[PDB]
Nucleic acid binder design. Structure first.
Ligand SMILES: [Zn+2]
Ligand SMILES: [Zn+2]
Ligand SMILES: [Zn+2]
Length: 82
DNA sequence: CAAACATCAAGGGTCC
DNA sequence: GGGACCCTTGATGTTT
């Protein structure tokens, strides 16, 4: 696909609009905010996964028995138990 | 005092 | 560019 060069550390970052999330590791900037617990995050998806704590959600449902888990690895461990 | 094991967050990839 | 989920590595912690 496409690649970018980091202006700060000469790192090569793959992704069209993915450079700013890499820059935020250097600037230490967390533009996103949890409306409930007010904790701030550098990436929107990291806020979304945090929101699964408040809005109790288990998207990783088991394809075998239907049980659902909040984290993908808890599903993996349950699947390996079968 | 270590390994072993576990959980979970941080960076980057990859598709859509 | 923006969402979103996956994968790898590492910090931190508990149990040997
Ligand atoms: Zn950089
Ligand atoms: Zn919150
Ligand atoms: Zn199951």
């Amino acid at each position: 696909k496409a690649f970018q060069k980091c202006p700060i550390c000469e790192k090569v970052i793959q992704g069209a609009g993915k450079l700013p999330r890499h820059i935020r590791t250097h600037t230490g900037e967390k533009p996103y905010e949890c409306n409930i617990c007010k904790v701030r995050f550098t990436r929107q998806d990291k806020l979304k996964v945090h929101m699964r704590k408040h809005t109790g959600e288990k998207p990783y449902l088991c394809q075998q028995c239907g049980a659902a888990f909040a984290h993908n690895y808890d599903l993996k461990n349950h699947m390996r138990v079968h």
